[PDB]
Write a protein that binds this DNA or RNA. Structure first.
Length: 115
RNA sequence: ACGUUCCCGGGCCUUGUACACACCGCCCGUCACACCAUGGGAGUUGAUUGCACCAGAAGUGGAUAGCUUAACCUUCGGGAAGGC
């Protein structure tokens, strides 16, 4: 919509189907990784602090704690790097952007389950 | 050449000594040059620890947003218990 019609025509082809999901829910993402001559898939599991929907340019940021330090990656929804996305756990958050979780470390960081 | 007061040496009695190769003795303290152990010393670097907090893995215990329910009860709808 926001883009010109000629641009929209190009974007529609790039669009790829993917399970819809909400903010603040634990998700597992499969990322293509190149080790040279071989291909592998790496699993990234984390709570989704922030999401932005822009049609083709939609992006979601996943935050996970590894060895006591958090890691945040702003994954691209429609990129071909992302082989698949699945929702391990669904949570309810008052606000779309969970930027208070960065300050939170342990017991506070957790998000209540949504039923 | 009165005389023993003195310079020197020698005889005896007593006295004090930290001296005994014996006063031509023994022996004290600073300064100078080395080497040793140590005290204070702006600090530098370790070990162990008092107290006040943050923290909340697995485990057990109270309670239930909720989910799956073999033993017994069932009016076969379910109840009882139990697990997550």
């Amino acid at each position: 919509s926001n883009k010109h019609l000629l641009v929209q025509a190009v974007e529609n082809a790039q669009i790829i189907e993917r399970p819809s999901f909400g903010p603040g829910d634990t998700v597992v993402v499969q990322v293509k990784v190149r080790e040279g001559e071989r291909e592998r898939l790496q699993a990234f599991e984390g709570i989704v602090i922030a999401k932005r929907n822009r049609g083709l340019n939609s992006a979601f940021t996943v935050r996970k704690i590894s060895s006591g330090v958090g890691v945040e990656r702003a994954f691209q929804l429609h990129s071909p790097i992302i082989e698949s996305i699945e929702v391990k756990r669904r949570g309810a958050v008052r606000r779309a952007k969970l930027y208070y979780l960065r300050e939170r470390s342990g017991k506070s960081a957790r998000i209540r389950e949504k039923l």
